[PDB]
Symmetry: C3
Subunit: 283 residues, 3 copies
Amino acid sequence: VVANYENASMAADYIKRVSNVLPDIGIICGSGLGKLIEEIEERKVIPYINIPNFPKTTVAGHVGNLVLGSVGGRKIVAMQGRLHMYEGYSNQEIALPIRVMKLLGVRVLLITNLAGGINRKLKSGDFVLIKGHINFPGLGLNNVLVGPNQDEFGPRFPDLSNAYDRLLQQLALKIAQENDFQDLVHEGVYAFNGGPTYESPDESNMLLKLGCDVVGMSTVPEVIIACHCGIKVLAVSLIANNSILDAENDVSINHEKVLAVAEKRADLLQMWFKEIITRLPLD
Amino acid sequence: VVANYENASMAADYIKRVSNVLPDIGIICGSGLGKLIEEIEERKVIPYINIPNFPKTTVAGHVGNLVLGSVGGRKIVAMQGRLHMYEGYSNQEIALPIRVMKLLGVRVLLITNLAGGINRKLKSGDFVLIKGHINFPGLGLNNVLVGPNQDEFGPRFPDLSNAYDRLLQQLALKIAQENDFQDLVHEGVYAFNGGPTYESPDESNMLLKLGCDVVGMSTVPEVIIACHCGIKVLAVSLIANNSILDAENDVSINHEKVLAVAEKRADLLQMWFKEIITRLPLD
Amino acid sequence: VVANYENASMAADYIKRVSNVLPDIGIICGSGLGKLIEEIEERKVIPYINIPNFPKTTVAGHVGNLVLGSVGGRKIVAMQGRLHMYEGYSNQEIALPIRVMKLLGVRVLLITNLAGGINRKLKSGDFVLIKGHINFPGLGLNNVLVGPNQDEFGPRFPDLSNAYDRLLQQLALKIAQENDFQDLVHEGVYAFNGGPTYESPDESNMLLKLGCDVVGMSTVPEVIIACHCGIKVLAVSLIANNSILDAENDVSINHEKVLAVAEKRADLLQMWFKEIITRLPLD
Ligand SMILES: Nc1ncnc2c1ccn2[C@@H]1O[C@H](CO)[C@@H](O)[C@H]1O
Ligand SMILES: Nc1ncnc2c1ccn2[C@@H]1O[C@H](CO)[C@@H](O)[C@H]1O
Ligand SMILES: Nc1ncnc2c1ccn2[C@@H]1O[C@H](CO)[C@@H](O)[C@H]1O
């Protein structure tokens, strides 16, 4: 399936009919997150299997439901699990859900993920506001946009220099200062590693040389598709482990540890995002 | 379609029949260039659509015609637009036109492109004689030569250490000194980014750390196919923008700005290449 | 063909039936190596063409036979040539022979390859015990494990921090000290370049900046598949050339020089590996 205007519209119209929601804000829940979903008011749950051409989640900690409803007076659509390129899906399959969000009316997209810390300061449980990225697949001819351009969504050559909206980062940090957890909040550059192997110790050391603060296997594809069709983005990494110090201590990383960190910070991440949604500009 | 001896020969024989030219020199015009095409004497224009298995150009500023004729007493074949891997074409489709040039008799290939400047010295309108490259797709398993080797054209494992002919660079610079525009001429390393997104600010900063002087989305595939079958290469980047200073000033890049820079320098680039063609060694 | 439990079992059962060997140790011979094959006692030779779904070797210096027998009292299975991703094979085709080894009973895998030296100290004929790697295809979405996970062999997200067993490296170096060729033995980080072009001079210079000691076009795929299914690995590079000093001297590299270096060191590499096999722990 191609992520074109026609197929995106078919999916959006199904969602519109079954949920009756026209959302302004979209949300993506990373590995093991999805406690925000219990706070949605007047909610409607739509399994991905019922949506025309929507792919199935295959990773632990990614529930395949779309949830719509009200949060902080605003209407939202939330992905309770995301798709990843290491699963074997094509760039058209990864791009489709974001283009459905565009046609539903989404103007601001709030993204979460779990990631490894590269910067030596970062420890398990910390948050990183993403301010830029290094797209290793994109440099090496696996960019999500390789192929015919879908002109109804955006330009052949998008500029990514404001992909991570500056005012949204400032707002997120202001709310953290207001509630006295600004000591958990950093800003940083996100490296996209295709995966599914964790970074080797020498790959982590290289990323540190190159100026990356965190590394993970998601997010950059969706961010580029959002930027291409004019959707503003805020992206936050929850740090699962520090890869540099782990390698020095011969400490292993595994997906069970990742899911446990997500469970320990999910309530706070839910509160933070609810307040950001509430304070977003009405335009 | 496979870029093998049989399919390359079919295309070359069509061209030979319709144009009656046996060219020694090949030319590739980058984005928005193609004013050299009006200086071709006794010219023959062949649309790509008429040539067996030739792909169609889909990018603005790339006209899909092959032009043959005389320049400076020598016989040439010029591509009035080029194919790019971000368009969705396979490595066999990108390689085919160069192997057609080989069978037509081409021994020297002169390449142009539009690119972003990484080196802080470079500004819009400058020229960079390419002296080497960093092939990010090739490092990451998307090299143009991955696949069965076509033995009639070259070796399984080509050496690229003289891919950019030293004496051609020296000749190009000598003519620029002769005509007092050597202050516009630099030498540099070209980074191949698959595209189609422009480099993010943090990707540009990384390229600067790694020793690259310019970055673009073309050229390295054709250069490797030429080197594989023994064709000498000169490659020149026309700088569209400086990506490092742009990111610092929050200045955006777009394809319209790219095409305008190409139009402002096209007459000089045409004069330069005509003189290089005229001065090339008769062997 | 998919490298799943069923297809791996079919191949393993054929081998078991025709050879009658249940091997504990697996071996892979790199370009132009394969003199260890004459030292196998009570040996059985099985051409790859007879094994269900085994691919054919297409590179010079890679004989397509599996050899089983006794060495140093232990039972082994040796690949007399290996498959490479630059040949055009899929990640399922490259992974299959390692998963066959797993089902045959292999617990320790000893790997050889020919490579370019990056570290300025390394010269033709030297050996490098590999202690880590930088997987450029893996960073850029061409990891050997992209796709559905084959759960019978290992986890969705493998940790690679002990992929190169520390005690095996120590044992290999101890035997070299015992026999007074420790001056030929180094330790280093291996960069995986997809190929098939040799590294350009500027790519070699970049690898040196990034902390790599050697570069080649193999090994990292098999190492990840082995680590995924719990097989311990020792990997040794035989240095064919120093790419940094070659570029400075305008000295070319070619596959004939590679094969000649392999022939000059094959007897010593055979003796070394026989002694390592003999001294391996019985668990
Ligand atoms: N240290 C790391 N390096 C890379 N990716 C990481 C981590 C930790 C978590 N993740 C993300 O979570 C999943 C793998 O556990 C994957 O979906 C992945 O994106
Ligand atoms: N700053 C840049 N970074 C990368 N590529 C660039 C530029 C500027 C121009 N190009 C080349 O021109 C087309 C995109 O405008 C593409 O064909 C591309 O090759
Ligand atoms: N200098 C180098 N850089 C990269 N690869 C190299 C070398 C030298 C040898 N090889 C390996 O041998 C084959 C190419 O000759 C290939 O199979 C390749 O793995």
